[PDB]
Amino acid sequence: SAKNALESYAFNMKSAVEDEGLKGKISEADKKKVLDKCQEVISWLDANTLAEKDEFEHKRKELEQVCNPIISGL
């Protein structure tokens, strides 16, 4: 269930930056970029549930790279 993993992961990063406390711990730009990216994958997840595992696996890598610069300061 790489789809479930991906969406939860994207939800998690999105929730973390958009968290009412972490919202002042991360910079607006990082918060924005990861949220937008999380929305990108999340809206894609909803569209490509039939994707292969590697599609999500790569999407995970993508999402990780967007949140990574933000998570490294969180």
Curated annotation (Swiss-Prot):
It is found in: Cytoplasm; Nucleus; Cytoplasm, Cytoskeleton, Microtubule organizing center, Centrosome; Secreted. The modification N6,N6,N6-trimethyllysine is found at residue 25. Signal peptide: none annotated. Acetylation enhances its chaperone activity and also determines whether it will function as a chaperone for protein refolding or degradation by controlling its binding to co-chaperones HOPX and STUB1. The acetylated form and the non-acetylated form bind to HOPX and STUB1 respectively. Acetylation also protects cells against various types of cellular stress. Induction: By heat shock. The modification N6,N6-dimethyllysine is found at residue 25. It is linked to In certain aggressive cases of activated B cell-like diffuse large B-cell lymphoma (ABC-DLBCL), plays a role in the cytoplasmic sequestration of misfolded N-terminal mutated PRDM1 proteins, promotes their association with SYNV1/HRD1 and degradation through the SYNV1-proteasome pathway. HSPA1A inhibition restores PRDM1 nuclear localization and transcriptional activity in lymphoma cell lines and suppresses growth in xenografts. Component of the CatSper complex. Identified in a IGF2BP1-dependent mRNP granule complex containing untranslated mRNAs. Interacts with CHCHD3, DNAJC7, IRAK1BP1, PPP5C and TSC2. Interacts with TERT; the interaction occurs in the absence of the RNA component, TERC, and dissociates once the TERT complex has formed. Interacts with TRIM5 (via B30.2/SPRY domain). Interacts with METTL21A. Interacts with DNAAF2. Interacts with PRKN. Interacts with FOXP3. Interacts with NOD2; the interaction enhances NOD2 stability. Interacts with DNAJC9 (via J domain). This is Heat shock 70 kDa protein 1A. The lineage of its organism: Eukaryota, Metazoa, Chordata, Craniata, Vertebrata.
